[PDB]
């Protein structure tokens, strides 16, 4: 029975984990995009500094 | 050698080659910069990044 208790928390564990995983991803690809945004933002301040 | 008569018309020709000499001046334009003009400060061209 202790196992069997055992087993069962650490399947829905690893299902919170896959849960984690996949929020993390969710925030990677929120920041990629901000990146992709701050590389233009860069870009563009380089071209308008010149005088 | 020259009586009074040419050297007035010399001195028009004159006039007129200054005349033009201050249009070049005053209308030498780049995209809105009156660069060999009588306000033309000197430019900066940001060349790379980390200002």
């Given at each position: 029975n202790r196992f069997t208790a055992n087993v069962r928390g650490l399947t829905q564990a690893a299902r919170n984990a896959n849960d984690g995983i996949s929020l993390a991803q969710t925030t990677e690809g929120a920041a990629s995009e901000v990146n992709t945004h701050l590389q233009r933002i860069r870009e563009l301040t380089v071209q308008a500094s010149n005088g | 050698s020259y009586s009074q008569e040419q050297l007035d018309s010399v001195q028009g020709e004159i006039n007129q080659r200054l005349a033009d000499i201050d249009r070049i001046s005053e209308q030498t334009d780049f995209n809105g910069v009156?660069?060999?003009?009588?306000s033309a400060k000197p430019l900066t061209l940001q060349v790379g990044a980390n200002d």
């Open positions: - | 009156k660069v060999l003009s009588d």
